[PDB]
Design a protein around this ligand. Sequence first.
Ligand SMILES: CC1=C(/C=C/C(C)=C/C=C/C(C)=C/CO)C(C)(C)CCC1
Length: 175
Amino acid sequence: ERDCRVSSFRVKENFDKARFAGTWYAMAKKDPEGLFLQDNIVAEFSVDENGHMSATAKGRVRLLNNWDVCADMVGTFTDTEDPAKFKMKYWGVASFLQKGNDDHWIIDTDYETFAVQYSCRLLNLDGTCADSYSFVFARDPSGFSPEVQKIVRQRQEELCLARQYRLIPHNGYCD
Ligand SMILES: CC1=C(/C=C/C(C)=C/C=C/C(C)=C/CO)C(C)(C)CCC1
């Protein structure tokens, strides 16, 4: 079989938090259960002088009563024994936005053009993920390069998530 156990998933070696800092445009995503960022998603990663990584994220989202809003989210990352695996505590500027603590894994990135992120929120008893999400980020809010598309596809197929992503519009609803 292709291994879909979360524990077997390869992640970015020698992940470099400082290099990852800056603006990342979410170009594609795979959604988890329940409420989630819908579109117009742009993240801003930062790393302080003590190496603590954090990020803000903007995106459009509809609230359980379908109502629409621009979310301003904030996340702070706790390092683990794996440099590419973090715990991300997050919340919104607005009190009504979802809060939580998610795995945040950098599956792959070249720091200059793309990144593939992943989070499993719930393990199946067989070790596969029961509830995941994943972002494909770009430094440039255009399309990738065929060459980069290939690499992202391979990563997506490592996560057992190939063919489960949707393209994300950007049209300044948030600005
Ligand atoms: C914080 C943040 C992230 C996740 C945001 C999430 C999970 C938003 C969910 C918002 C909801 C459900 C709002 C409605 O109440 C990602 C991974 C983009 C990276 C940058 C920082």
